[PDB]
Design a protein around this motif. Structure first.
Motif, PDB file in Angstrom:
ATOM      1  N   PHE A   3      -6.564  -0.669   8.082  1.00 46.90           N
ATOM      2  CA  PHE A   3      -5.305   0.100   8.062  1.00 46.90           C
ATOM      3  C   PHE A   3      -4.036  -0.747   8.279  1.00 46.90           C
ATOM      4  CE2 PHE A   3      -8.385   3.623   8.566  1.00 46.90           C
ATOM      5  CZ  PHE A   3      -7.853   4.586   7.692  1.00 46.90           C
ATOM      6  N   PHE A   4      -4.037  -1.824   9.080  1.00 45.20           N
ATOM      7  CA  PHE A   4      -2.769  -2.455   9.505  1.00 45.20           C
ATOM      8  C   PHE A   4      -2.185  -3.503   8.548  1.00 45.20           C
ATOM      9  CE2 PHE A   4      -3.742  -0.403  13.579  1.00 45.20           C
ATOM     10  CZ  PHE A   4      -2.463  -0.059  14.054  1.00 45.20           C
ATOM     11  N   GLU A   5      -2.922  -4.561   8.193  1.00 42.99           N
ATOM     12  CA  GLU A   5      -2.304  -5.756   7.578  1.00 42.99           C
ATOM     13  C   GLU A   5      -1.711  -5.503   6.177  1.00 42.99           C
ATOM     14  OE1 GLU A   5      -3.391 -10.300   9.131  1.00 42.99           O
ATOM     15  OE2 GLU A   5      -4.817  -9.256   7.793  1.00 42.99           O
ATOM     16  N   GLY A   6      -2.224  -4.502   5.449  1.00 46.58           N
ATOM     17  CA  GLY A   6      -1.835  -4.225   4.061  1.00 46.58           C
ATOM     18  C   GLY A   6      -1.054  -2.930   3.803  1.00 46.58           C
ATOM     19  N   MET A   7      -1.108  -1.913   4.677  1.00 44.65           N
ATOM     20  CA  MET A   7      -0.565  -0.586   4.316  1.00 44.65           C
ATOM     21  C   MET A   7       0.954  -0.467   4.427  1.00 44.65           C
ATOM     22  SD  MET A   7      -2.975   2.710   4.994  1.00 44.65           S
ATOM     23  CE  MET A   7      -1.946   3.540   3.743  1.00 44.65           C
ATOM     24  N   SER A   8       1.587  -1.088   5.430  1.00 41.43           N
ATOM     25  CA  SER A   8       3.020  -0.848   5.687  1.00 41.43           C
ATOM     26  C   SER A   8       3.905  -1.232   4.503  1.00 41.43           C
ATOM     27  CB  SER A   8       3.497  -1.628   6.914  1.00 41.43           C
ATOM     28  OG  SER A   8       4.817  -1.261   7.259  1.00 41.43           O
ATOM     29  N   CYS A  11      -7.658   5.285   1.013  1.00 42.29           N
ATOM     30  CA  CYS A  11      -7.156   5.411   2.386  1.00 42.29           C
ATOM     31  C   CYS A  11      -7.506   6.771   3.013  1.00 42.29           C
ATOM     32  CB  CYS A  11      -5.641   5.162   2.415  1.00 42.29           C
ATOM     33  SG  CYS A  11      -5.263   3.457   1.927  1.00 42.29           S
ATOM     34  N   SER A  12      -7.374   7.861   2.252  1.00 40.01           N
ATOM     35  CA  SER A  12      -7.718   9.221   2.690  1.00 40.01           C
ATOM     36  C   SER A  12      -9.205   9.357   3.041  1.00 40.01           C
ATOM     37  CB  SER A  12      -7.328  10.197   1.576  1.00 40.01           C
ATOM     38  OG  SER A  12      -7.547  11.549   1.935  1.00 40.01           O
TER      39      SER A  12
END
Lengths: 50, 154, 52, 49
Positions: A22-27, D15-16
């Motif tokens: 979730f962290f390194e790529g989503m923002s 992601c979902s």
């Protein structure tokens, strides 16, 4: 204490799985979508440094 | 008093029975190991409660507050309470705890398998070798005419 | 428009994950209290009766 | 423009699905805790009788 320690290891495995993907790529991916649906008129002047 | 002492002494004798739970090696195929009754009954009670919690979660995300779902939730909670109380009266607390420890261990191994399967896909560079993802599930062959672009065009 | 609705769905699911993590931490704390309450009831209320 | 939106849609669906997997694990953990908590309440009731 054995059961609650196994449940902590389960929670740590879940936390590792949540960090890695979730962290390194989503923002970075969400910010760019606010640009109006202008069919790109290639107007020369405004394309920035990329 | 004597009847109560007999009941507690029966629970103590039941606690002394060692429950063998089978080793979770991942590559070992289908073999016929009988699941302990405590593990089955604790799993079904936990699964009924999980289905209830999931139904509450799906209804919180889907803004369709359909009002006819409250009576079915109360029935599902009473059915869970009765089954959970039955489990606490049929099985010893030690066996119920050991079945929960086994369920937590299984859940931890499922998460680790999911971590390894996704890491192997990132190291292949862009060469589109569409090899044999085999088995699953669905194709409900019914449907009508519609034009849907076979979209795995690279 | 589907891309925007999917972003809002991702945010709702993320809030629910935070609620569940906090709920499970509370439940773990409550199980520990219930164990101590049951032991304390046995010590303070049941164990004295044989002498009377 | 068509190729970019298909890529964004595929990424969001992935992601979902990963969020649902994390939710399902936390709910299984929650179900196990509520079974243990009911066990203590039933024990305390037998002690009162």
């Amino acid at each position: 204490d054995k059961y609650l320690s196994l449940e902590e290891q389960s929670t740590a495995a879940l936390t590792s799985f949540t960090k890695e993907h979730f962290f390194e790529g989503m923002s970075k991916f969400v910010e760019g979508s606010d640009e109006n649906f202008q069919l790109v008129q290639l107007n020369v002047n405004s394309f920035g440094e990329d | 008093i004597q009847y109560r002492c007999e009941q507690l002494q029966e629970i103590r004798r039941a606690s002394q029975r060692e429950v063998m739970f089978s080793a979770v090696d991942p590559d070992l195929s289908s073999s016929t190991f009988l699941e302990p009754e405590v593990l089955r009954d604790v799993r079904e009670v936990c699964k009924l409660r999980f289905k209830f919690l999931r139904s509450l979660h799906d209804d919180s995300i889907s803004s369709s507050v359909h009002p006819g779902k409250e009576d079915l939730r109360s029935l599902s909670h009473q059915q869970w309470m009765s089954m959970a109380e039955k489990v606490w009266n049929t099985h010893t607390p030690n066996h119920i705890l050991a079945a929960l420890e086994r369920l937590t261990l299984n859940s931890t191994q499922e998460l680790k398998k999911l971590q390894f399967s996704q890491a192997a896909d990132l190291s292949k560079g862009p060469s589109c070798q569409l090899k044999e993802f085999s088995e699953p599930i669905t194709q409900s062959r019914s449907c009508n005419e519609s034009t849907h672009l076979d979209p795995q065009e690279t | 428009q589907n891309i925007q609705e999917a972003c809002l769905l991702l945010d709702k699911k993320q809030k629910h994950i935070q609620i569940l993590i906090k709920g499970n931490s509370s439940s773990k704390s409550q199980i520990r209290r219930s164990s101590v309450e049951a032991q304390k009831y046995v010590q303070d209320k049941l164990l004295p009766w044989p002498q009377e | 423009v068509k190729g970019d939106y298909d890529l964004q849609m595929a990424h969001q669906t992935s992601c979902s699905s990963r969020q649902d997997l994390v939710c399902d694990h936390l709910m299984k953990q929650k179900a196990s805790f509520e079974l243990l908590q009911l066990g203590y309440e039933l024990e305390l009731r037998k002690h009162r009788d």
